[PDB]
Write a protein that binds this ligand. Structure first.
Ligand SMILES: [Cl-]
Lengths: 192, 193
């Protein structure tokens, strides 16, 4: 399932750019029209509610994230644990992309379909984590006494708690900005 | 006047537990509380003010829960960490309401300084009580001396909070956290047992 409308993709990207720069409150049809170079008429016929404009950004953020998973899983030489560290890092709001994604997801977390979008985001994230936990177990690096389902639920919950607190609380933002932060999350989940 | 404001905040929490944030209106809070809309209007200027009072009240009750837990005769540090952790999980009306109202304000705090500072105080209070118990366990020799108490604390609070927030929107996480041993498992993950 892909968005083929290059203009809608560009509009959703302008929304995310605005979210990273100025926060969700700065998103309006007028501000996005100004950011993107297209008319309020063009936007009003795509969306006609701020909610739909934000929802576009949520979906675009999810798609880019899915491409990140792909890049991470297909990296030559990387093992299950490196992949899990990379997946975990990719959720942490440590650059503009991930700052915008965390902000738009948090906005819709609270409003919750698209709690359907949220569910899809979570299920795909757990999906890629579970595969790599199971791969690490198969390699013998993670205890086969551990339930891969429980490990996955723990890692995803920890990572998301950190990502969400971090945008509210500079204590946690400092914590996740440490070079070893993703590796620490993974180690806690799989028990080193 | 101050007890009346508190009772009204309690009414908002009751609605939040039962039917969600969207159920909070002047009329519903009057019906729930027994106070007329004119008494409500005296204390609160807006629906948003009702919700902020609920956030503050939920945090205050949670503060009293910490003190009850920390004061339990014969409870050890690990037991206290377990009970602290469980006290956050949305497993009854109190904790369901609390998680729902915090989630609302997390989203708001992702934009507004007033709500952000309320969330920050709550998280710091919670880390403070967790850290006390983590260091007490290290001092008794039951938690590894080679772990950094602050890092363990950040991790446990983030895990517990991630699970509580995910639980109110994800039925499988809700199922996971309602297992008797859920809080024990969170503590063990965080202290790298
Ligand atoms: Cl409790």
């Amino acid at each position: 399932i892909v968005d083929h409308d290059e203009r809608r993709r560009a509009l959703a990207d302008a929304v995310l750019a605005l979210i990273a720069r100025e926060g969700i409150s700065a998103v309006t049809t007028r501000a996005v029209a100004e950011e993107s170079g297209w008319s309020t008429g063009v936007l009003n016929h795509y969306f006609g509610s701020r909610h739909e404009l934000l929802l576009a950004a949520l979906r675009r953020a999810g798609d880019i994230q899915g491409d990140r998973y792909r890049t991470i899983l297909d990296e030559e030489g990387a093992g299950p644990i490196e992949k899990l560290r990379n997946i975990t890092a990719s959720i942490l709001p440590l650059d503009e992309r991930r700052l915008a994604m965390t902000r738009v997801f948090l906005f819709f977390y609270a409003e919750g379909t698209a709690r359907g979008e949220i569910a899809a985001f979570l299920a795909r994230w757990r999906g890629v984590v579970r595969e790599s936990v199971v791969a690490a177990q198969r390699e013998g690096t993670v205890s086969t006494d551990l339930d891969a389902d429980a490990v996955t639920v723990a890692l995803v919950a920890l990572t998301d708690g950190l990502a969400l607190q971090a945008i509210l609380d500079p204590v946690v933002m400092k914590a996740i900005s440490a070079e070893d932060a993703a590796a620490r999350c993974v180690d806690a989940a799989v028990r080193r």
